[PDB]
Design a protein around this ligand. Structure first.
Ligand code: ZN
Length: 258
């Protein structure tokens, strides 16, 4: 009885094994655009992904992660509300069984078809495992996906998913450039929050971009053919791997733009 996204082990159960589920700075949240405060003190984000080295893609039974070499400052995020340099370790997505749900964060209660998470850790803490124990340890860039036109830069990801269909499977995944996943604008909302899967630690500065990217229905269809299970246990499709919005409680969302 591990955690997952079903009736009997899904997000409403997580608090029994991970009491921080009901904590004060849980994610995701609904971003109320009329209540978010423009903060002209916020700098532009600086994304330096020119030297990124992807290594591997894997199905971990809750999502698929693309993992990067984080042994040096090769793909980093700086600026914005951040102090210091945050190194890219992995990205993954959350998505739905249908196009009208899938994102974790919502914008004035609107759900998108999926959500991309680029996970970065603060180099002052030396490694990811020490970083997750700190209130400013991680920075996650969240990018919404809507269904319309194809995103060419995502196709390389979609084509390998056949090779990692079940939990535990991995494949070599070199020379992927994450710059092909960014929207045009880097305007953003930011708030302090948590990992959205167990162990749900409250170590994340969230940076959620205003502008969604478009993907095609055929591209998102392929995400939905993955499996939560291992080979061959009974087939459970990897769909609806998102946590619902949590209470904002004592937190302000700030916007980089008006
Ligand atoms: Zn995520």
């Amino acid at each position: 009885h591990h955690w997952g996204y079903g009736k009997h082990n899904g997000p409403e159960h997580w608090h029994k094994d991970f009491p921080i589920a009901k904590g004060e700075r849980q994610s995701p949240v609904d971003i109320d655009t009329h209540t978010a405060k423009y903060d002209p003190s916020l700098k532009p984000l600086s994304v330096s992904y020119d030297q990124a080295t992807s290594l591997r893609i894997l199905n971990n039974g809750h999502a698929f992660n693309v993992e990067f070499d984080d042994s040096q400052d090769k793909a980093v995020l700086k600026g914005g509300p951040l102090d210091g340099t945050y190194r890219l370790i992995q990205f993954h997505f959350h998505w739905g069984s249908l196009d009208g749900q899938g994102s974790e964060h919502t914008v004035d209660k609107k759900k998108y078809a999926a959500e991309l998470h680029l996970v970065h850790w603060n180099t002052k803490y030396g490694d990811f495992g020490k970083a997750v124990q700190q209130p400013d340890g991680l920075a996650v860039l969240g990018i919404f996906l809507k269904v319309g036109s194809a995103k060419p830069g995502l196709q390389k990801v979609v084509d390998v998913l056949d090779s990692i269909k079940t939990k535990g499977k991995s494949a070599d995944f070199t020379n992927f450039d994450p710059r092909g996943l960014l929207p045009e604008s880097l305007d953003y909302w930011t708030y302090p929050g948590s990992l959205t899967t167990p162990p749900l630690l409250e170590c994340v500065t969230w940076i959620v971009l205003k502008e969604p990217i478009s993907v095609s229905s055929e591209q998102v269809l392929k995400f939905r053919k993955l499996n939560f299970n291992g080979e061959g246990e009974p087939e459970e499709l990897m769909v609806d791997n998102w946590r619902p919005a949590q209470p904002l409680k004592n937190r302000q969302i700030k916007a980089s733009f008006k």
